[PDB]
Amino acid sequence: MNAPDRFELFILPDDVPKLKITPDSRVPNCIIIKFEREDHTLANLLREELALYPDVTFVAYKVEHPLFANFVMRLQTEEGTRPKQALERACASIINKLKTLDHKFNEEWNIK
Amino acid sequence: SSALFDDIFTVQTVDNGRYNKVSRIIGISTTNSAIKLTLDINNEMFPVSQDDSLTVTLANSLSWRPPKPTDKSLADDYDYVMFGTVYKFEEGDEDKIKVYVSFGGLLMCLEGGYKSLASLKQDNLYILIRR
Amino acid sequence: QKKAMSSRAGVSQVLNRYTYSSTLSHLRRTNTPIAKPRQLHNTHW
Amino acid sequence: SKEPKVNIINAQDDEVELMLSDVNLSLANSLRRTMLAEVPTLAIDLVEIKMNTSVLADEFISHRLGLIPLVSEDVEEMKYSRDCTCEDYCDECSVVLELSARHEGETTDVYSSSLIKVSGPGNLNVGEPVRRDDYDQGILLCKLRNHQELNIRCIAKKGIAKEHAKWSPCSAIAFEYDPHNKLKHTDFWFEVDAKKEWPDSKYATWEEPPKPGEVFDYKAKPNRFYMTVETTGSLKANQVFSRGIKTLQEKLANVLFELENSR
Amino acid sequence: MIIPVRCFSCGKVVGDKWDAYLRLLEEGKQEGDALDELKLKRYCCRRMVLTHVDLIEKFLRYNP
Amino acid sequence: GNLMGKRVDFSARTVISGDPNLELDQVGVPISIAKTLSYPETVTQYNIHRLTEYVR
Amino acid sequence: REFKIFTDVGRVYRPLFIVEDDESKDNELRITKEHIRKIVYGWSSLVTSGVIEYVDGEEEETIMIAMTPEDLQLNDTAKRIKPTFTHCEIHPSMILGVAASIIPFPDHNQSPRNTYQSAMGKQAMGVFLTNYNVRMDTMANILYYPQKPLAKTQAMEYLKFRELP
Amino acid sequence: VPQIGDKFASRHGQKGTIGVTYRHEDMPFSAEGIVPDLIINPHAIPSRMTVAHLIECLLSKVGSIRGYEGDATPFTDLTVDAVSNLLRDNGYQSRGFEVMYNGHTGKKLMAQVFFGPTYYQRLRHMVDDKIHARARGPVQVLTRQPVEGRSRD
Amino acid sequence: LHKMSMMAHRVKVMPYSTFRLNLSVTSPYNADFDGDEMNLHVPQSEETRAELSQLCAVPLQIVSPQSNKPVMGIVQDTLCGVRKMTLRDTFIEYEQVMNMLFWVPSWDGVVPQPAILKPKPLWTGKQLLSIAIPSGIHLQRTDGGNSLLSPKDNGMLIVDGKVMFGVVDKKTVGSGGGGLIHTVMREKGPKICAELFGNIQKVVNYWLLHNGFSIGIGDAIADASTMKEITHAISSAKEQVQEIIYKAQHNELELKPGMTLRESFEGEVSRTLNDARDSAGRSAEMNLKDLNNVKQMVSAGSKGSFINIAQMSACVGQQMVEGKRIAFGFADRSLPHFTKDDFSPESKGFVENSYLRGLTPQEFFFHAMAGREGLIDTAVKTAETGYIQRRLVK
Ligand SMILES: [Zn+2]
Ligand SMILES: [Zn+2]
């Protein structure tokens, strides 16, 4: 009756970006990234793999409001080091970890 | 850049007054018999039983940087380092003083009277302990 | 009927049909025309 | 071998118990829900009822069929009819099925086996009424008396558990770690003795007890996780893990693509 | 009112188990065990059939 | 009944449910309702731009 | 020193068990396990054999009723503490009407609460009849998939509840 | 369909409406896999005092696992201590309680929860039968003020 | 019936057919979600709006003029949990300490020095909760046995807007006089304090969301030996009654001045049964450790009190109507299942059982007649007070 159409939790509508990055004035070298159409599934995963990279000085996230499947992530790192890269790497590291996993899950499997 | 306290005490007793993971201990000084110490502590993180020889130190110095300082200074040559603030300066008769120290939720009490020019009235205060 | 409403209204209603136990209750219902009557007496046991 | 490591446990056709070690909890949980909610499947979405003398109403039946598990082997090579440049739907983007059931023998039953697959499969095992039943006719839809008819026509589509529950192939998933509370990420309730009053978990048999004389290890983090992935059929439990890893990747892909588009 | 495809609580199918159940009753005289063998472990999927009230039967005795 | 208190227009009523992520003074309103109640706001060369979007 | 006789039409009455001291070898309920297993034998005979009597509110005044048939003719420190006989109570859980009759363990809730459910029950959804598919009545609701409760009262057995959850 | 507003209740005066609706992931769960369909607040217990609810839950958590029909009838010879032992014979905690992992992070809950199957009636009084909003609509005749009831706008 | 029964709120359009209101503003209207409906009115002039924000704004209403104290505090979950979250035993690590500051809209953007650095760097609730409290907020308490080193972690001391020691609950964040709310309005202003809520909320709820919390029958059972220790306090009390009934069926008792021998008979039974139940529960009260959830919800101050627990785990108590123990509707007796002139407690309405044990028929009945009285006026004083009110207004 008043509930949106289910498929609005992942499909982006007419000109709208998945990612929105804003600079932080509060402190030097900091940003707040607005993620569209997402949740804890992908969020918490990025947050985690950042406290592994001892080059990240800060990494938190939050859900503005539960009705809308979105979330803001605020990250702050050391001097002259762009977070995006550490995000790429650790994200790639996930894929590598997963590439390995996949493989390691295939050989393991085969022995049945 | 100097020290403001150095003394080994002895656990008079350990109290776990309704705390499954924290115990409040008390102990007198080995030097003067006027300096007492009351301090709450994480019995889970740092176990301690009655009759122990601990060395307490203090002072304020060596956003909040994460670790990384492994190849930087490290005045952490100890095994317990809390941060907090001090509030009151009480005088129990004579010229004996006694400051009350709370660490963001963790209380502490010092007593004696010989820091009439050592223990300041600022917020700063870092606790240290060893062995 | 007539210009004689000087009767009692409540008697005979529109049998509930929300749930079975609802309908049941309704037939097994008693009324009582009007601080003491409302009390739950012993005799009700 | 090295960094992350897999350790499959007892696995069958409709389950895959297993141990995932050398990984952060964060990522286990992440993967957890991805199977539960974001794995492509295939369920009926549009129903063009032709005849129905059943005691059940139209949309009552429509619901039922939505949950029934269909094949999803080559499910990954299809597009949503909405994205398909064909007005509405078609073989190149949808799968149509028929169903007619007339009551003649004056109680006739309607099992899912009576469904044909009139539309074009694009030549790939998929869109088939997954039967694991011994005879060949899983899930009895309904019964009917004397002269009651029933003519349907189902159309199936992609979709995921997010869009609707009628999709997810998971259906319950076990997850536990550190059965003997050593990390103390919990404070057990009790009246006298915790150990005796608190049931030992069947996973407690794969790890050594605490052992008192040892102090509390603190620098330790949540490593090794005992799971179990139940399946309903449609996709082999293994793919139901791979595709997840992959869908997550596909997401992780755009996460890297969209990234560039912001450079 | 007929059996519920997939259990609300967890999701596991439960459409097929109907005829199987009503048989393991009539003859083999089981409950607990039947279920256990039907592969219905945890109470979540369990409660669905054992709590199902097949109304449809009386409805089917109706004309149209 | 009708004078010391009367039924009035521009009013609505529904079912309440609390939200722990709404500022103290806020009040989440159901889309349906927002699409029903209006407010006479005069046209001004400062909000025309915003109004011209809203009107289309 | 008086005798009240009422034949009247409109007198509420309940049924009770008869005790009678017919034991010339000690001090016991007239009913036996033979009447039981025997259950041309209606309820009218169960009365035509002097095994139950209809005691109205007035007559009650001058009688003494025993609660539990058994007991009223060491312990576990967990269970509930329990505290000439002329009549016995068929069963205490029969003093309830439709509403409370469906409430599990009403003797464990604050009584005024039971009184609430006693009303809300008359406002839930389910199935109110089976002919429903042939009724042209204004307003009516049927719960998609019903479900008989996981816990029940022996009395429910007479409220056909299992067939109409 | 039940909506984020429809009213519900058990058989213990524990009436309540929907505040939100989560899915399987977001939902808390137990090692076994088993996940809840409903989550009501512990605060609705202390002053309501309705304890049988908690009991109805336990009993019903046994008949579920044991497959045997659960008798709840009034004054019989069944106690919480008795039931608790039977539930210990089957495998799960003697009081019902189970461990749960927060559906968002996967990390365990520092506490334990009273997880157990309880009967729930879906009382009528669903939102879309109450939701009403008007701005200058059908006016009454005698008064000329608006009209009564949401049904007549 | 309140000045606060109507307040201006900021509109936030959201989906789904329902009015979404904040939790803390529940008690002013005195509403719940068990089906309650709410009326909404929509302003129409340019001035009307100003009038709505300058006189009816929620922040201005924070302080109720009738009792020169607030009328909105922290309820249920948020209250209940903030207590836990506050305890010395409550520690939080970086990973969570990050997601918590982020959740605070007002965060100054400065991470406070960890209360621990030594092996693993942890924090405590008391700490983070303070980041929601603005600078310059000075609070001093002192309860009963309260002195600069609170053993049981009692009292409350906040300087510069940072928690030093003590637990936070009903007493410290309730609609009370000293109330931390009352002070932030007065010291900082309406706006900031109205915002203060949202922060304190988001933070607590989040923590609880991860720490979890529940309640179940287990939180209502008394020790194995305690259930015995109580029994003989009811047995002895029964005889301590039988004694004074014997000592009454002998005229060996005096009429408490101003009262009738019958009234004076009453006067003792009541003070005997009451005091019994009163300690009966108190025996369990101190027998329920500081982890028992039901207890927690009593210390937190978020629902129920001693009495409640008592009536659920020990003895419900004696029932009564019109001030006197169950009358004699049946000539010279409570029920026909009793010997006439039976003055004992099982007849005059004394439920010796606990809800946990499941009351006897008789007891179950009496109990209702007592409750029955409640509902009566609750369906009369509800509008008769309103009647009495209407006059006062008019
Ligand atoms: Zn198409
Ligand atoms: Zn299930």
PDB file of N, CA, C and O in Angstrom, chain H residues 29-69:
ATOM      1  N   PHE H  29      20.360 -15.004  14.936  1.00  0.00           N
ATOM      2  CA  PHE H  29      20.172 -16.438  14.711  1.00  0.00           C
ATOM      3  C   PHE H  29      20.935 -17.309  15.693  1.00  0.00           C
ATOM      4  O   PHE H  29      21.771 -16.821  16.434  1.00  0.00           O
ATOM      5  N   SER H  30      20.692 -18.614  15.643  1.00  0.00           N
ATOM      6  CA  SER H  30      21.354 -19.544  16.551  1.00  0.00           C
ATOM      7  C   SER H  30      22.230 -20.530  15.795  1.00  0.00           C
ATOM      8  O   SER H  30      21.882 -20.947  14.691  1.00  0.00           O
ATOM      9  N   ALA H  31      23.381 -20.853  16.390  1.00  0.00           N
ATOM     10  CA  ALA H  31      24.374 -21.783  15.833  1.00  0.00           C
ATOM     11  C   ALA H  31      23.760 -22.892  14.988  1.00  0.00           C
ATOM     12  O   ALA H  31      24.239 -23.182  13.898  1.00  0.00           O
ATOM     13  N   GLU H  32      22.722 -23.523  15.525  1.00  0.00           N
ATOM     14  CA  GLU H  32      21.987 -24.599  14.867  1.00  0.00           C
ATOM     15  C   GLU H  32      21.585 -24.185  13.450  1.00  0.00           C
ATOM     16  O   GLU H  32      21.523 -25.010  12.540  1.00  0.00           O
ATOM     17  N   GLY H  33      21.312 -22.893  13.284  1.00  0.00           N
ATOM     18  CA  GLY H  33      20.858 -22.327  12.026  1.00  0.00           C
ATOM     19  C   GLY H  33      19.560 -21.601  12.313  1.00  0.00           C
ATOM     20  O   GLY H  33      19.406 -20.439  11.932  1.00  0.00           O
ATOM     21  N   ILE H  34      18.628 -22.317  12.943  1.00  0.00           N
ATOM     22  CA  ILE H  34      17.300 -21.833  13.346  1.00  0.00           C
ATOM     23  C   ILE H  34      17.234 -20.321  13.551  1.00  0.00           C
ATOM     24  O   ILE H  34      18.076 -19.760  14.252  1.00  0.00           O
ATOM     25  N   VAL H  35      16.235 -19.655  12.980  1.00  0.00           N
ATOM     26  CA  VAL H  35      16.176 -18.210  13.131  1.00  0.00           C
ATOM     27  C   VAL H  35      14.740 -17.828  13.529  1.00  0.00           C
ATOM     28  O   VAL H  35      13.795 -18.541  13.186  1.00  0.00           O
ATOM     29  N   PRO H  36      14.570 -16.722  14.282  1.00  0.00           N
ATOM     30  CA  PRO H  36      13.241 -16.291  14.719  1.00  0.00           C
ATOM     31  C   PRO H  36      12.357 -15.656  13.659  1.00  0.00           C
ATOM     32  O   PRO H  36      12.854 -15.093  12.684  1.00  0.00           O
ATOM     33  N   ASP H  37      11.047 -15.764  13.856  1.00  0.00           N
ATOM     34  CA  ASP H  37      10.096 -15.133  12.965  1.00  0.00           C
ATOM     35  C   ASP H  37       9.690 -13.834  13.640  1.00  0.00           C
ATOM     36  O   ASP H  37       9.338 -12.863  12.976  1.00  0.00           O
ATOM     37  N   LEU H  38       9.727 -13.830  14.971  1.00  0.00           N
ATOM     38  CA  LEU H  38       9.334 -12.653  15.736  1.00  0.00           C
ATOM     39  C   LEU H  38      10.245 -12.292  16.911  1.00  0.00           C
ATOM     40  O   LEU H  38      10.812 -13.171  17.559  1.00  0.00           O
ATOM     41  N   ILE H  39      10.382 -10.994  17.173  1.00  0.00           N
ATOM     42  CA  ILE H  39      11.197 -10.504  18.286  1.00  0.00           C
ATOM     43  C   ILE H  39      10.456  -9.460  19.117  1.00  0.00           C
ATOM     44  O   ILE H  39      10.375  -8.298  18.719  1.00  0.00           O
ATOM     45  N   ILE H  40       9.917  -9.862  20.266  1.00  0.00           N
ATOM     46  CA  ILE H  40       9.213  -8.913  21.120  1.00  0.00           C
ATOM     47  C   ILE H  40      10.139  -8.508  22.272  1.00  0.00           C
ATOM     48  O   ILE H  40      11.060  -9.242  22.625  1.00  0.00           O
ATOM     49  N   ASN H  41       9.894  -7.333  22.841  1.00  0.00           N
ATOM     50  CA  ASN H  41      10.745  -6.782  23.896  1.00  0.00           C
ATOM     51  C   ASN H  41      10.520  -7.277  25.327  1.00  0.00           C
ATOM     52  O   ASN H  41       9.381  -7.373  25.778  1.00  0.00           O
ATOM     53  N   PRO H  42      11.611  -7.607  26.038  1.00  0.00           N
ATOM     54  CA  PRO H  42      11.574  -8.067  27.433  1.00  0.00           C
ATOM     55  C   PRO H  42      10.842  -7.110  28.386  1.00  0.00           C
ATOM     56  O   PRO H  42      10.399  -7.549  29.444  1.00  0.00           O
ATOM     57  N   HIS H  43      10.729  -5.836  28.017  1.00  0.00           N
ATOM     58  CA  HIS H  43      10.055  -4.831  28.847  1.00  0.00           C
ATOM     59  C   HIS H  43       8.547  -5.057  28.954  1.00  0.00           C
ATOM     60  O   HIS H  43       7.899  -4.539  29.866  1.00  0.00           O
ATOM     61  N   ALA H  44       7.986  -5.818  28.022  1.00  0.00           N
ATOM     62  CA  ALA H  44       6.552  -6.086  28.036  1.00  0.00           C
ATOM     63  C   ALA H  44       6.215  -7.247  28.974  1.00  0.00           C
ATOM     64  O   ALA H  44       5.149  -7.849  28.864  1.00  0.00           O
ATOM     65  N   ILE H  45       7.162  -7.615  29.834  1.00  0.00           N
ATOM     66  CA  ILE H  45       6.965  -8.722  30.777  1.00  0.00           C
ATOM     67  C   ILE H  45       6.854  -8.326  32.278  1.00  0.00           C
ATOM     68  O   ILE H  45       5.899  -8.729  32.939  1.00  0.00           O
ATOM     69  N   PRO H  46       7.821  -7.540  32.817  1.00  0.00           N
ATOM     70  CA  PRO H  46       7.814  -7.137  34.235  1.00  0.00           C
ATOM     71  C   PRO H  46       6.536  -6.602  34.894  1.00  0.00           C
ATOM     72  O   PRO H  46       6.210  -7.062  35.989  1.00  0.00           O
ATOM     73  N   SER H  47       5.830  -5.669  34.264  1.00  0.00           N
ATOM     74  CA  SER H  47       4.631  -5.113  34.889  1.00  0.00           C
ATOM     75  C   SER H  47       3.362  -5.765  34.370  1.00  0.00           C
ATOM     76  O   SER H  47       2.309  -5.688  35.001  1.00  0.00           O
ATOM     77  N   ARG H  48       3.469  -6.406  33.213  1.00  0.00           N
ATOM     78  CA  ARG H  48       2.342  -7.108  32.633  1.00  0.00           C
ATOM     79  C   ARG H  48       2.189  -8.349  33.506  1.00  0.00           C
ATOM     80  O   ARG H  48       1.086  -8.869  33.680  1.00  0.00           O
ATOM     81  N   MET H  49       3.327  -8.830  34.018  1.00  0.00           N
ATOM     82  CA  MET H  49       3.400 -10.002  34.896  1.00  0.00           C
ATOM     83  C   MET H  49       3.021 -11.337  34.248  1.00  0.00           C
ATOM     84  O   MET H  49       3.254 -12.386  34.837  1.00  0.00           O
ATOM     85  N   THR H  50       2.404 -11.298  33.071  1.00  0.00           N
ATOM     86  CA  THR H  50       2.034 -12.516  32.354  1.00  0.00           C
ATOM     87  C   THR H  50       3.227 -13.464  32.172  1.00  0.00           C
ATOM     88  O   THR H  50       4.041 -13.304  31.263  1.00  0.00           O
ATOM     89  N   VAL H  51       3.323 -14.454  33.061  1.00  0.00           N
ATOM     90  CA  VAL H  51       4.415 -15.423  33.021  1.00  0.00           C
ATOM     91  C   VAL H  51       4.094 -16.661  32.179  1.00  0.00           C
ATOM     92  O   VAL H  51       4.970 -17.165  31.478  1.00  0.00           O
ATOM     93  N   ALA H  52       2.852 -17.147  32.248  1.00  0.00           N
ATOM     94  CA  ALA H  52       2.423 -18.316  31.467  1.00  0.00           C
ATOM     95  C   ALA H  52       2.897 -18.228  30.019  1.00  0.00           C
ATOM     96  O   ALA H  52       3.146 -19.255  29.387  1.00  0.00           O
ATOM     97  N   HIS H  53       2.957 -17.006  29.485  1.00  0.00           N
ATOM     98  CA  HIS H  53       3.434 -16.783  28.126  1.00  0.00           C
ATOM     99  C   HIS H  53       4.797 -17.451  28.016  1.00  0.00           C
ATOM    100  O   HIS H  53       5.021 -18.294  27.146  1.00  0.00           O
ATOM    101  N   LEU H  54       5.709 -17.035  28.893  1.00  0.00           N
ATOM    102  CA  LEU H  54       7.058 -17.582  28.943  1.00  0.00           C
ATOM    103  C   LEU H  54       7.010 -19.102  29.062  1.00  0.00           C
ATOM    104  O   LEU H  54       7.844 -19.811  28.501  1.00  0.00           O
ATOM    105  N   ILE H  55       6.026 -19.592  29.814  1.00  0.00           N
ATOM    106  CA  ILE H  55       5.856 -21.022  30.033  1.00  0.00           C
ATOM    107  C   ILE H  55       5.292 -21.677  28.769  1.00  0.00           C
ATOM    108  O   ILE H  55       5.773 -22.732  28.351  1.00  0.00           O
ATOM    109  N   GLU H  56       4.254 -21.070  28.189  1.00  0.00           N
ATOM    110  CA  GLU H  56       3.647 -21.587  26.963  1.00  0.00           C
ATOM    111  C   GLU H  56       4.746 -21.799  25.932  1.00  0.00           C
ATOM    112  O   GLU H  56       4.731 -22.761  25.166  1.00  0.00           O
ATOM    113  N   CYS H  57       5.705 -20.879  25.946  1.00  0.00           N
ATOM    114  CA  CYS H  57       6.850 -20.889  25.052  1.00  0.00           C
ATOM    115  C   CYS H  57       7.688 -22.138  25.290  1.00  0.00           C
ATOM    116  O   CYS H  57       7.968 -22.895  24.356  1.00  0.00           O
ATOM    117  N   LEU H  58       8.111 -22.327  26.538  1.00  0.00           N
ATOM    118  CA  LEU H  58       8.926 -23.475  26.924  1.00  0.00           C
ATOM    119  C   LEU H  58       8.251 -24.762  26.482  1.00  0.00           C
ATOM    120  O   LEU H  58       8.799 -25.486  25.654  1.00  0.00           O
ATOM    121  N   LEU H  59       7.116 -25.082  27.100  1.00  0.00           N
ATOM    122  CA  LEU H  59       6.326 -26.259  26.748  1.00  0.00           C
ATOM    123  C   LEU H  59       6.303 -26.442  25.229  1.00  0.00           C
ATOM    124  O   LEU H  59       6.676 -27.494  24.716  1.00  0.00           O
ATOM    125  N   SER H  60       5.842 -25.415  24.514  1.00  0.00           N
ATOM    126  CA  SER H  60       5.757 -25.480  23.053  1.00  0.00           C
ATOM    127  C   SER H  60       7.110 -25.688  22.367  1.00  0.00           C
ATOM    128  O   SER H  60       7.162 -26.095  21.208  1.00  0.00           O
ATOM    129  N   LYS H  61       8.199 -25.390  23.071  1.00  0.00           N
ATOM    130  CA  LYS H  61       9.532 -25.586  22.515  1.00  0.00           C
ATOM    131  C   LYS H  61       9.908 -27.053  22.667  1.00  0.00           C
ATOM    132  O   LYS H  61      10.788 -27.561  21.973  1.00  0.00           O
ATOM    133  N   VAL H  62       9.221 -27.734  23.579  1.00  0.00           N
ATOM    134  CA  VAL H  62       9.467 -29.148  23.797  1.00  0.00           C
ATOM    135  C   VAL H  62       8.646 -29.969  22.819  1.00  0.00           C
ATOM    136  O   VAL H  62       9.202 -30.786  22.085  1.00  0.00           O
ATOM    137  N   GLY H  63       7.328 -29.782  22.824  1.00  0.00           N
ATOM    138  CA  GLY H  63       6.469 -30.510  21.902  1.00  0.00           C
ATOM    139  C   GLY H  63       6.908 -30.393  20.453  1.00  0.00           C
ATOM    140  O   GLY H  63       6.585 -31.243  19.623  1.00  0.00           O
ATOM    141  N   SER H  64       7.636 -29.320  20.152  1.00  0.00           N
ATOM    142  CA  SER H  64       8.165 -29.083  18.820  1.00  0.00           C
ATOM    143  C   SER H  64       9.273 -30.098  18.558  1.00  0.00           C
ATOM    144  O   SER H  64       9.221 -30.863  17.597  1.00  0.00           O
ATOM    145  N   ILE H  65      10.282 -30.084  19.427  1.00  0.00           N
ATOM    146  CA  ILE H  65      11.442 -30.970  19.325  1.00  0.00           C
ATOM    147  C   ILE H  65      11.095 -32.437  19.585  1.00  0.00           C
ATOM    148  O   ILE H  65      11.670 -33.337  18.972  1.00  0.00           O
ATOM    149  N   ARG H  66      10.166 -32.672  20.507  1.00  0.00           N
ATOM    150  CA  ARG H  66       9.789 -34.029  20.895  1.00  0.00           C
ATOM    151  C   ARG H  66       8.702 -34.631  20.005  1.00  0.00           C
ATOM    152  O   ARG H  66       8.460 -35.836  20.046  1.00  0.00           O
ATOM    153  N   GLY H  67       8.050 -33.797  19.199  1.00  0.00           N
ATOM    154  CA  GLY H  67       6.999 -34.275  18.317  1.00  0.00           C
ATOM    155  C   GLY H  67       5.689 -34.638  18.994  1.00  0.00           C
ATOM    156  O   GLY H  67       4.664 -34.803  18.331  1.00  0.00           O
ATOM    157  N   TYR H  68       5.716 -34.754  20.319  1.00  0.00           N
ATOM    158  CA  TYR H  68       4.528 -35.080  21.094  1.00  0.00           C
ATOM    159  C   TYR H  68       3.705 -33.825  21.355  1.00  0.00           C
ATOM    160  O   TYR H  68       4.251 -32.743  21.564  1.00  0.00           O
ATOM    161  N   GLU H  69       2.384 -33.978  21.338  1.00  0.00           N
ATOM    162  CA  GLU H  69       1.477 -32.863  21.580  1.00  0.00           C
ATOM    163  C   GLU H  69       1.612 -32.405  23.029  1.00  0.00           C
ATOM    164  O   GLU H  69       1.624 -33.217  23.954  1.00  0.00           O
TER     165      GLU H  69
END
